[PDB]
């Protein structure tokens, strides 16, 4: 009926729960001392201070139409509409703040809540012009997730009440959690309207998944009570944290002081206005009659009656005064609106010290987007030691301050809340104040499983425990694929997608030089008996075997193709098909004239090796990188005829003369130039042995392509040279020394 009408140049309407619900009996119940009247009086104290403020709106006296919500939606609109008719700060409970916004926006009238938090009033597609002096409990997600990060704590069970605010906080928490790589072990909502066993069931469900032995709660305290009672009854072993829906609330921790130790709560930090507490404590509305609902307040606050003027004898100040911290939002809402108006006037009435006609109409968005959210200062009457940067984000979220505190063991007294730290936009905490984490207390109970193993080891794929997957190595040829395996690369060792070769080069070159230095001795002496008595064409085919060993050595190291590996294998015949075989006729003539005997031998040499040539030039397998799933960094192989028994045909070609003819060793007894006759008998035998000594490399070195290439290259050059000298010794003795 009454609206505390205040006079002014600009009138701000508003809406407070002066009365409780009268349910179906009356529309209005008794007055709300703490929710209604104290908040209104604080509003008025602030409004009078604003009108008397030398810097804030000096040209605009603020009048008012403050409505009685009667704690009902019906009244909120029957009365909110009066401010439209008349041409807003209000909203305590939320059904009211929402519906009022639905009407005010239609007339381009902005609304700031002073107490209503609800996250639904974030939806600007339905509620565009509004601001919330208090951020909804959704925000606590941010702090909650940060507390878990502080603790290195991460993998965790979580709970809401049956609250839609509970859903809101849980969804919000999931978002903030995922952003920080924090995993839900498991979670649920919790009815008020369920048996104690159901509350125990919730606690058991936590305790039934002990991958971490810790949890977090969104709630309202009636639930937090029975949850904490169930925790205590079950002797539940965990640590846990709650939303300020159970912040502090000594009342919850009374049945279960012991279980209550393992926990922290947020509260929105309290910064009571002592100036207003003073004004209210000394307030005496009997005389200061402006607020019409005080007569009821007096009668019930002090037990008296004004019917007989009995309350008149009991000054209101007689009853001790206390206030909710909430008073600061009542005040911030009026100052924030006044400031928005102030800035609006600086923008629309820039050169005038009194309200301008520009502000007679309702301005919509001009207030809302440009001045209402763009508020930034320290709140008046706030304790001097701190700051709240009153501001709103683009959705009207009033930016705020929050105490983070734990319930301490008191072996010498009652258990007490203790500030550990605070939240603001981020978290600060002193660990020494935590009973389960301060270093002397030991570590937090399991709150972890496994690391971001996403590398040379990658996660397992353990069913269920995804956020707890084991760490497992890949295999030494692969590259990163998923969080849990690796793709096979190209060929090479773990790709992430000839040291002694100088040996054979040196010996081959030296072999060739020595070979020809000696040939020139034999050739210079072609007209000398040392050559006339020799199978000179064969002497030369034999000597040439070392020169060929040299040539073959370089072929042996040619980039692999069938063009060269066939020759390579044949070359292991060739070297002695000539280096041993000339002994055949030397031996024969000492042991169809000699000229023909030589031609016959030459034909035999070529014939037998050519049989083998025919056998190898027809082999299909060639060169490549077959390599091995082992080693992997093996590059460019010679033809894949490893340990091929066809090689025995080369050994044969040599033994065909070298072992199979040694009856002729008797030649050493022949009375013709004994220096040579003795050596032919000696060297045929010795040579067979020397060559056989080199031979085993055919299988011995097959395990390593660089080693066997290097080895055969040296052995071929060396074997040939060692052997030639076996008989050249007496030939050169005579030529060079006689």
């Amino acid at each position: 009926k009454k609206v505390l009408t205040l006079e002014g140049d600009l009138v701000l309407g508003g809406l407070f729960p002066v009365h409780q619900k009268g349910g179906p009996a009356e529309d209005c119940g008794p007055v709300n001392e703490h929710r209604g009247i104290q908040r209104l009086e604080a509003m008025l104290f602030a409004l009078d201070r604003i009108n008397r403020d030398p810097h804030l709106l000096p040209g605009v006296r603020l009048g008012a139409h403050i409505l009685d919500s009667c704690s009902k939606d019906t009244h909120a609109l029957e009365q909110a509409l009066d401010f439209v008719r008349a041409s807003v700060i209000g909203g305590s409970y939320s059904d009211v703040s929402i519906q009022v916004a639905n009407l005010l926006r239609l007339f381009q009238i902005p609304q700031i809540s002073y107490a209503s938090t609800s996250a639904k009033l974030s939806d600007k597609s339905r509620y565009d012009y509004f601001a919330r002096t208090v951020p909804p409990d959704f925000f606590q997600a941010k702090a909650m997730a940060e507390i878990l990060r502080f603790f290195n704590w991460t993998y965790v069970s979580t709970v809401a009440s049956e609250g839609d605010y509970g859903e809101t906080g849980i969804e919000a928490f999931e978002l903030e959690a995922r952003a920080r790589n924090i995993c839900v072990a498991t979670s649920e909502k919790v009815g008020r309207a369920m048996s104690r066993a159901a509350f125990e069931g919730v606690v058991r469900a936590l305790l039934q998944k002990p991958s971490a032995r810790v949890a977090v709660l969104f709630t309202r305290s009636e639930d937090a009570r029975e949850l904490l009672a169930a925790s205590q009854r079950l002797n539940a072993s965990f640590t846990w944290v709650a939303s300020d829906g159970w912040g502090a609330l000594e009342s919850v921790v009374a049945g279960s002081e012991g279980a209550a130790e393992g926990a922290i709560t947020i509260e929105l930090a309290s910064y009571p206005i002592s100036d207003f507490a003073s004004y209210f404590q000394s307030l005496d509305p009997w005389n200061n009659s402006r607020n019409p609902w005080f007569r009821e307040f007096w009668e019930q606050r002090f037990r008296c009656s004004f019917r007989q003027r009995d309350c008149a004898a009991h000054s209101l100040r007689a009853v001790p005064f206390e206030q909710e911290s909430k008073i600061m939002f009542v005040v911030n809402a009026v100052y924030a609106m006044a400031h928005a108006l102030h800035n609006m006037h600086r923008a629309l009435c820039p050169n005038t010290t009194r309200l301008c006609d520009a502000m007679r109409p309702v301005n919509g968005r001009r207030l809302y987007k440009d001045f209402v959210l763009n508020v930034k200062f320290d709140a008046p009457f706030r304790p001097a030691d701190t700051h709240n940067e009153v501001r709103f984000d683009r959705f009207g979220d009033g930016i705020g301050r929050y105490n983070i505190f734990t319930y301490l063991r008191a072996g010498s007294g009652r258990y007490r809340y203790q500030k550990v730290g605070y939240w603001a936009e981020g978290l600060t905490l002193d660990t020494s104040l935590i009973p389960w984490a301060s270093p002397s207390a030991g570590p937090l109970p399991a709150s972890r499983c496994s690391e971001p193993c996403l590398q040379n080891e990658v996660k397992s794929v353990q069913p269920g425990e995804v956020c707890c997957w084991l760490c497992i190595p890949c295999q030494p040829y692969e590259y990163r694929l998923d969080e849990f395996t690796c793709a096979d690369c190209g060929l090479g060792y773990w790709p992430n997608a000839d040291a002694w070769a100088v040996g054979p080069v040196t010996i081959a070159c030296l072999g060739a030089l020595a070979t020809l230095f000696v040939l020139g001795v034999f050739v210079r002496h072609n007209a000398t008996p040392v050559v006339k008595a020799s199978g000179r064409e064969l002497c030369y085919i034999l000597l040439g075997g070392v020169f060929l060993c040299y040539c073959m050595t370089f072929i042996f190291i040619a980039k692999p193709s069938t063009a060269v590996c066939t020759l390579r294998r044949l070359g292991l015949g060739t070297a002695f098909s000539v280096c041993y075989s000339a002994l055949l006729t030397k031996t024969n003539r000492i042991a169809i004239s000699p000229a023909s005997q030589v031609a016959i031998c030459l034909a035999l040499i070529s014939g037998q090796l050519l049989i083998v040539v025919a056998w190898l030039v027809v082999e299909a397998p060639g060169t490549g990188k077959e390599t091995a799933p082992e080693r992997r960094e093996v590059v460019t192989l010679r033809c894949n005829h490893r340990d091929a028994s066809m090689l025995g045909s080369l050994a044969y070609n040599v033994l065909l003369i070298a072992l199979c003819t040694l009856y002729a060793f008797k030649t050493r007894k022949c009375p013709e130039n004994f220096n040579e006759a003795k050596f032919i008998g000696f060297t045929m035998y010795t040579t067979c042995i020397i060559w056989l000594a080199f031979l085993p490399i055919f299988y011995v070195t097959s395990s390593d392509y660089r080693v066997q290439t290097t080895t055969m290259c040296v052995s071929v050059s060396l074997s040939g040279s060692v052997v030639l000298g076996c008989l050249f010794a007496p030939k050169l003795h005579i030529i060079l020394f006689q």
């Binding site: 509409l81 008719r85 639905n102 009407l103 007339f107």
Partner: protein
Amino acid sequence: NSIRIDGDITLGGLFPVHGRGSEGKPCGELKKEKGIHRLEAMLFALDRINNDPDLLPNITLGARILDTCSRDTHALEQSLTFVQALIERVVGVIGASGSSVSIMVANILRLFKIPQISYASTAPDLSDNSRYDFFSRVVPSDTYQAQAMVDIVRALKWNYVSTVASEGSYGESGVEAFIQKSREDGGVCIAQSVKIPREPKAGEFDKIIRRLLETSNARAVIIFANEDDIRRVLEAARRANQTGHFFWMGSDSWGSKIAPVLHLEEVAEGAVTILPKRMSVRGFDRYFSSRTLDNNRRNIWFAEFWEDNFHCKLVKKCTNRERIGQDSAYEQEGKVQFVIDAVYAMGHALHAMHRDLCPGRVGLCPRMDPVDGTQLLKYIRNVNFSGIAGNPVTFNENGDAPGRYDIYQYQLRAEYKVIGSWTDHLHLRIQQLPRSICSLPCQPGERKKTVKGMPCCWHCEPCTGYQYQVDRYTCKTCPYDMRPTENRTGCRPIPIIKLEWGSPWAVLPLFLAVVGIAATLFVVITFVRYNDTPIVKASGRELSYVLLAGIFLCYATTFLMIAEPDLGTCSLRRIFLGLGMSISYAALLTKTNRIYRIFEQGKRSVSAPRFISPASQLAITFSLISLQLLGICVWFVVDPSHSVVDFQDQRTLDPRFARGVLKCDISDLSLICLLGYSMLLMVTCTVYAIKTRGVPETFNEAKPIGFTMYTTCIVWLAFIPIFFGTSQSADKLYIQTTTLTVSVSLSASVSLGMLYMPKVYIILFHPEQNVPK
């Protein structure tokens, strides 16, 4: 201000009596064709409801009417008087009009639990029941009419179109619904979409047309805008001389309304627009036509109705007696059925409520004064009845009437004729007018490339090179067998070139080789006739035999080098490319060596060189021949004879001139290696000729042999530079072949010129000289 009609219960009503307007009057001209036409009809229906013994029995239904103007901020402010009566009491409203008018009001009345019904705005937005929990239309939304427009464009087989809409939820979401449904169908691309401001500038419309005309593959335009917006565009069309350039179309925003088309009748010929399925109301048409304009009580604008419909005061004051039906002042109102329907529908819902809420009463029941509109809403959705003119009244729970509407054609001679109808499917029959379709179809070989990703559009790109078509969008390379059809429908044989033995160049060796054989035989016959005469025996009769056979083959080989390709040709060619060169040298080596050995042997011993006897010497010649035969056999083994067709050599830029070649596949490796061995015998012969420089004239053939080699080795060696130098020519098929034929035939000629021809002359013509020299 407003009309206040007494009754026992009251129903609100809302209509654009004014349009929008200026800042001082947001309410300019009277829109009589949405407003007062329909208002009287509502009031008519209101009286009929009150006069209906079976509807709201014993209850007078009163009313409250307001003028929307059109700028909907006027609606609400007003709604506030209406609202104070709601919270003299009003039960509900007929609210309707355009978008901004309906959507603002749906958000105020629902907050007091007051139901609202629309005879008008079809916009999608109002089907959000979380925002319009108290609301229904009485018509199908733009979700249907947009689909219908898409179906009609697809029935026109058009693909490419321009749209225009003015501001406000109706236009802006409506055309956006058409755009999205068109895109979902995929059979259409939007050339463009043009917004009209609520307050456009004059001349913008000419600019709009010029923009509409840029997309010249469109000949049609779609409209959701209001009446006036359309005249500004079609008036511009007259100025722009676009009359009959275009098809034009409308959602419900315009149609049977005559003020759109009048004075611009040729503009938008055949234009197709939609109206919600509508019938006239004869009882009203009659009443309206016959009503005296000063006998209409409780209608504050009816005096204005006279003034605007009769173009004079009710100065030119004219007699009030004239019926509106007697002048141009009168016609049938296009939507009157809906406004009458909507008010009855609420009356029927109220009736259903009384039979529920107040089942034992007629006349007033106190329970309905503070009636919970939720129950009123239940009957708004639950009541189903045959409406006025027999049109069934039903709408779903989001308040859409189910889709049903009629398709009209603007016919000149001029009226909107029915083309057909739609209920999620078209039933149209056809007037002949332009087409709106994007890219035009493409020729054979014109492989389409899509214009961007735009489904209805392409570039008709002609296929190229050796490619032939495989899809409307795709062409692919024809294999080596063929060069494309010019139409690129497929592919056609590469013409294959053969080496012609009669070509201008092939004819030279073709006949020289024959002459060579004839000359060789002249010599052979003489030698045979004189086989037992010393003049023949002295040079080695058998050695002569082999040399002459060699010469014969040299020429036979060259003749055959230009022989028609076959496998028989390849095998014989390869064996003889070798033999036709090597036999001659093998024979020369044997004989030349015999001379050299005798010459040097005589310096040390009288004994003839051992094995110089023909018994061994002939074998030497044949052994050298066999060594080559074995090498040739290897060449056949590693890479065997084949008659093949070369496509790759002349795959030219213009495939009509692409030519393949039918050739014997003799690799240049063997073409040379088959000659290389023979060359080495030639080299050896040259060396023997050098070794023999000290040989005296007493050796009958020692000198002319040296001479044959002096020339022969050049004839041959000249082959290589030419063979390779000409290897890059398009004509190499005959150039390299004749290069080879010429040196082989010439070498044969050289041998005859020094060793046989002058000897034959003496053997045959001078018997007195037939001595062993």
